[PDB]
Amino acid sequence: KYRVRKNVLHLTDTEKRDFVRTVLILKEKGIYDRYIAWHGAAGKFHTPPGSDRNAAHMSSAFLPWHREYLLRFERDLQSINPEVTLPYWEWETDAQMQDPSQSQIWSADFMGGNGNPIKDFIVDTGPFAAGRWTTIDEQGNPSGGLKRNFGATKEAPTLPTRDDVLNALKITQYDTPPWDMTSQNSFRNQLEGFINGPQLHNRVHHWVGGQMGVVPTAPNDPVFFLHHANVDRIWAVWQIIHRYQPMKNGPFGQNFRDPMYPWNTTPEDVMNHRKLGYVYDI
């Protein structure tokens, strides 16, 4: 319970400072990249081979897989600075502002601005400007800087609304067969964003564009973790009123007690975020 993830808009200037600062040590030491590669590899790992499913997406493992990813990440954050926790970007309310692109979250004193078209959309403001922050594609080779493109598509021109979220929290079943994209009536698939997609989680990705728009190169952007803290919390919160599928008869690595490549972690090991050691602002 006793470790609290706040709303970014609740953070003090010293917190945003410690966060942004602590994240650079991790990039520096070489531990942040481990997180990029785990996530990339999880996405190549299809369950089973020949399937749309992969270990970390497009199935029930989506939520636990990412829960453990953050938990593992936040612990590393702690080792550097014990006073730091993982914040959440509450995109669903940024979505109401006349111009979400203006949300404090994008301040040069935290993550940084939208991409600079004049530089083919390389972000050139904030701590993760190209030059200060290296990035790497899918082949696992340097790529030359973070690129953002706030609502540049037509598929995802806007962030998800409070009603998109509220309407997901209403789903009875954590997940249903066939435990994939085409999963009807399943809190998992809905939050993820495939029902009339992209929505919710998926939509946030496409909206930011840049690396974030591609699963193979999403963690290259720290927003990735703020986005997923909010996803995690949506679930966390779901978990109080409805408080997993499948248990068995899912593909291997989708069941309650299966291992989640690239780890030996199981859905069950992280079903109670408090037993993990952290809570949200609520």
Which residues of the shown chain bind its own copies in the complex (CB under 8 A)?
29-31, 33-34, 37-38, 40-41, 44-50, 54, 134, 136, 139-142, 251-253, 259, 261-262
**Cα 154 from Cα 211, distance rounded (Å):** 18
Least distance between Zn ion and beta carbon 104 (Å)? 9
Closest CA to 133 of 210, 58, 70, 39: 210
Peptide bond into 267 cis (omega under 30): no
Strand partners, 279: 4
Q: Which stretch binds Cu ion (CB under 5 A): 135-143, 152-160, 183-191, 208-216?
A: 208-216
Residue ranges that bind Zn ion, judged by CB under 5 A: 6-7, 10, 13, 120, 165, 236, 281
Least distance between its own copies and beta carbon 185 (Å)? 26
Q: Please say which residue, 86 or 215, places its beta carbon nearer to Cu ion.
A: 215
How many residues touch Cu ion under the rule CB under 5 A: the total is 2
Q: Would you count residue 156 as binding Cu ion (CB under 5 A)?
A: no
Strand partners, 57: 54
Closest CA to 103 of 221, 9, 172: 9
- By a kind-dependent CB cut-off of 5 to 8 A, residue 236 interacts, out of its own copies, Zn ion, Cu ion, none, with Zn ion
62-80 and 31-44 helices, crossing angle to 10°: 170
Count the residues in the chain.
Answer: 282
Least distance between its own copies and beta carbon 255 (Å)? 11
**Cα 210 from Cα 217, distance rounded (Å):** 9
The residue type at 75: R
Q: Would you count residue 215 as binding Cu ion (CB under 5 A)?
A: yes
Site string for Cu ion, 164-203 (x = CB under 5 A): ----------------------------------------
Residue 200, phi-psi category: left (phi > 0), alpha (psi -120 to 50), beta (remainder): left
Q: Please say which residue, 138 or 281, places its beta carbon nearer to Zn ion.
A: 281
What DSSP element (H or E) covers 4? strand 4-5
- By a kind-dependent CB cut-off of 5 to 8 A, residue 215 interacts, out of its own copies, Cu ion, Zn ion, none, with Cu ion
**Cα 70 from Cα 170, distance rounded (Å):** 25
- By a kind-dependent CB cut-off of 5 to 8 A, residue 82 interacts, out of its own copies, Cu ion, Zn ion, none, with none
**Cα 279 from Cα 282, distance rounded (Å):** 8
Q: Please say which residue, 57 or 203, places its beta carbon nearer to its own copies.
A: 57
Q: Please state the residue numbers annotated as binding site for Cu(2+).
A: 39, 57, 66, 201, 205, 228
Applying CB under 5 A, the residues found at the interface with Cu ion are 215, 218
